[PDB]
């Protein structure tokens, strides 16, 4: 209901927040429908002034205060059916040279690199992390798709997998940046309830995350 004048109402609220007895010698919480009624009161003030945006900008502090794939098919088949370490290593390396040539081909190998991400032995697992992070350096949308396999590698029973996930932790935290709280929390809890010291990696990730946080 438009019973009250919006100009007098907003002026009264703004003066009630800024009573000089409250701030002498030196932030009010409102409910849901209260904040709603405030925002269409501000809108109603905007339309009754429109009969520009300066008064809306002046009322903003109060609302702030109240609130090709065909040529890669044999490589897919060799990487999927690789049983020995020799076959997996040679097909991962063969992907690696032409990824250094053509970086866009790595999107076809995404989930299969996710499978090789938690590999038991060291060289193809490190190569899987390298090729994966190279794939994610291009498209940030790929970063959320590697979250379950990265948190699985952090919480894996295999200790080598945990170490190689912790080594690539700051690069992945930089690449993802919307799941970085859960990632660094998992890294800490792996370090805390394990016997690892990921404080250097977590500190570097937190520092750089702060550096693009202040931008």
């Amino acid at each position: 209901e438009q019973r009250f004048d919006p100009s007098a109402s907003l002026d009264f609220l703004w003066a009630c927040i800024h009573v000089p007895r409250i701030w002498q010698g030196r932030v009010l919480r409102v409910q849901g429908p209260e904040l709603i009624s405030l925002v269409e009161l501000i809108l109603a003030e905007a339309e009754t002034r429109s009969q520009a945006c300066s008064l809306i900008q002046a009322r903003l502090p109060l609302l702030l205060s109240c609130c090709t794939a065909a040529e890669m098919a044999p490589y897919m088949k060799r990487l999927s059916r690789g049983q020995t370490v020799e076959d997996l290593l040679e097909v991962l390396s063969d992907i690696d040279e032409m990824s250094r040539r053509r970086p866009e081909i790595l999107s076809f190998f995404s989930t299969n690199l996710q499978r090789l991400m938690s590999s038991a032995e060291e060289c193809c697992r490190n190569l899987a992390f390298s090729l994966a992070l190279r794939s994610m350096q291009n498209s940030p949308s790929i970063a959320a798709a590697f979250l379950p396999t990265f948190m699985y590698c952090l919480g894996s029973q295999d200790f080598e997998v945990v170490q190689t996930a912790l080594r690539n932790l700051p690069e992945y935290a930089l690449l993802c940046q919307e799941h970085a709280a859960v990632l660094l929390h998992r890294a800490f809890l792996v370090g805390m309830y394990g016997q690892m010291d990921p404080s250097a990696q977590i500190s570097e990730a937190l520092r750089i995350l702060h550096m693009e946080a202040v931008m």
Binding site: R21, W23, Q24, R26, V27, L184, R186, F188, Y193, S203
Partner: protein, 410 residues
Amino acid sequence: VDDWICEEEITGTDALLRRMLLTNNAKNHSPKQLQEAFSAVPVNNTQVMQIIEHLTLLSASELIPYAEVLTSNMSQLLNSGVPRRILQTVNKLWMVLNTVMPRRLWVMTVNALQPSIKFVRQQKYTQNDLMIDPLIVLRCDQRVHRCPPLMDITLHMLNGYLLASKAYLSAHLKETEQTREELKNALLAAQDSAAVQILLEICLPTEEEKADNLLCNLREVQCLICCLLHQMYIADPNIAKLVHFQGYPCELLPLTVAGIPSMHICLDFIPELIAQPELEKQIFAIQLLSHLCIQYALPKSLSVARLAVNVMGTLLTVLTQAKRYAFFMPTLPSLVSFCRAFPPLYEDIMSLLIQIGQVCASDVATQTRDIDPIITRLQQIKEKGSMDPDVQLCHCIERTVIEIINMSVS
């Protein structure tokens, strides 16, 4: 100075209003008439509005006969529904009367603001009694503690009697002379510290009102008390050092740091306070530095923050398990503020948090546990009583690193 700078002229509006309104010669206004207005059992606020609004036009020399009727009816002004304008006007008239008759007026106001449970409750408070024990002025009706116009009056009397007790003690010392200087200085320092501690306990949100933090009477009382403490810390920083060595509840710490601008000198003795043998002093020093680093991000504040991190790292290896719990449960939230003020401290804070967490997981593994947090090493971010202290400390470590990561990501 506050009792003297009020006599300074502003714009000539008061002399103009006096000349244009006091010449109405409506001489019905009198101490007897105002007393009859107060003493009405069906009390009307309108008549006392009219009388004291007329009284504001009077000079201080001619407001003398109204002192008794103004003071002795101040107990009725706390009676749950007295309008704010009556209280503000009475405070204004008391401030006017303070410039011409303060030695009498303070005694009358102290006698008026007693709880009055008994017939008198020591109405024989003399000036000598209040100069002997200035803390008498804090033994008021206890409804004044949420009445800001009477907090102004009682803080004025408290500051005055605290100043007067020094002169009284010097006079008694010279009279009884016919060392004791050290004992007098210790008594004065302890007296001011006790006054500050009682004032800070008044600022606490008592549990009767606990079960809008900005538009309440408590906020105005907190601001008045913070102003008085700012003046007293400026007058004697040793009182601030003594009070922070004594310590106050940590709920008052954001209020004292934000509201008292002279709290930045606490960084001078926080290195001294953190070296105290008692664990509570070190806990309070770390909690105080936590808010001071947010308020003032100085290079010396960073140096003291590094010192506090080193002290916590050393006390991790000095304290026993019960002492580790009792020390690290209050001081762990200070690390979030240390990381917020100083992003270079990330490496030290995270290494310290790894060390505390790995220490505290080991004695979790030592005894059998009702909830076993070692299995729950793979947990997601949870939403923001009889549990084991070690598991509670582990959850505190996890919560603090959660807040640190959330703060640094944002």
